[PDB]
């Protein structure tokens, strides 16, 4: 849409009260102008054929419950965009300042989310097990990311290489999630995840295993579903991820946490310089090595919790 760039207000899926960017022309959309090519939401109104319509809103005022999923899609991709901007200097998924295109109202009572290859789609839960996906920064964190993997190592979706592609999504929409400062912690999809359930979430960065997910690669499922695991065994990278991080001590294997913009900044050179499609887990700790040496030094202190971290999870 060609109109003037203003700005919105409205309230989120968790009743909070957000300013987002819009344009107007004869109606209001959300549209944001500011960030790139720039950030499109759209109503895909309970139906399957995407993208659906540009959301317009009549007066700028985004209160209604329909609402709700439409304004924390629009801004969380505003805040994602932020995060890979200022903290990688990349611009947009494809680092051209491509369009990001999100759709909400995503069939009946879909309990998933996902990145389809050219935009984020987005459920509104059954009300019970899910509440409207979008409501979840990490959660919009980790399909953005998907994109952003896409154009660079371009990770199978499959056994290995898909379950890097799941952890680099969970470990890069936990550091969008610090980034924003809402409530970080190391936990996926906790803010949308059982409205009736408290302190659950979907997966576990800091202890994979409290959800059935393997935490060392012993552990490892060698089966068929989930293309192979992809969002089973993605627990052995998130769990390496947290202790270089943080720290700690995981099965008698000591490591010295290095924190978490400097596990962004290392996993990121991994992703776009070291990574390929068909990389396995024991590629992905040569790429982090790799990764810490180029930016620490060899002889480093983060080479040598990269390391201890493989070790303690059993990745070489
Ligand atoms: C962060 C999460 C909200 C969405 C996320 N989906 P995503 O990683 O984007 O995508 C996965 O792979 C794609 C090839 C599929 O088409 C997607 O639906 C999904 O299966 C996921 O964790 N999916 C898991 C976990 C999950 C989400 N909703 C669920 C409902 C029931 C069971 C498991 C799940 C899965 O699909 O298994
Ligand atoms: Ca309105
Ligand atoms: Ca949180
Ligand atoms: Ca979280
Ligand atoms: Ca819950
Ligand atoms: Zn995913």
Redesign the pocket.
Known sequence: ITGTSTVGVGRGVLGDQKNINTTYSTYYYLQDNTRGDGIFTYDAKYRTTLPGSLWADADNQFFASYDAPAVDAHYYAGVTYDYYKNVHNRLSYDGNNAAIRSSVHYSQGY?????NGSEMVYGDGDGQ?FIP?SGGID?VA??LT?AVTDYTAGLI?QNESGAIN?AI?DIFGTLVEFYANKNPDWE??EDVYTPGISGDS?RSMSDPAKYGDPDHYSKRYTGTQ?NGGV?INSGIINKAAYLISQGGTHYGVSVVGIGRDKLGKIFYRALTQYLTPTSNFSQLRAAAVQSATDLYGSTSQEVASVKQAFDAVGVK
Request: aromatic share 16%; hydrophobic share 35%.
């Open positions: 309990n998933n989310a996902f990145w097990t996906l959660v980790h399909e998907h979706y799941e999504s996926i999809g979907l989930d969002h």
